[PDB]
């Protein structure tokens, strides 16, 4: 109900709205500049692959 999830190519621009909250002009992965939309801050996400934190450890 919060909006459909899509991958982001990049953040094109930023602004503050009338309510003093941050909005982000998003370039959507697979779409051009015409399809760029202003999204509220809480709509942005960082995704990560599941990792085995032990593989990363360095021995000597």
């Amino acid at each position: 109900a919060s909006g459909d999830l899509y991958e982001v190519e990049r953040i094109v621009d930023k602004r503050k709205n009338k309510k003093g909250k941050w909005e982000y002009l998003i370039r959507w992965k697979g779409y051009g500049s015409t399809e760029d939309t202003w999204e509220p801050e809480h709509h942005l996400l960082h995704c990560e692959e599941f990792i085995d934190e032990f593989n990363g450890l360095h021995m000597s």
Binding site: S2, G3, D4, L5, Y6, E7, V8, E9, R10, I11, Y24, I26, W28, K29, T34, D36, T37, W38, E39, P40, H43, L44, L45, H46, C47, E48
Partner: peptide, 14 residues
């Protein structure tokens, strides 16, 4: 490297 993603507003503000 972390993927960038976001929820799209419907209707949209261009």
């Amino acid at each position: 490297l972390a993927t960038k993603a976001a929820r799209k507003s419907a209707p949209a503000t261009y």
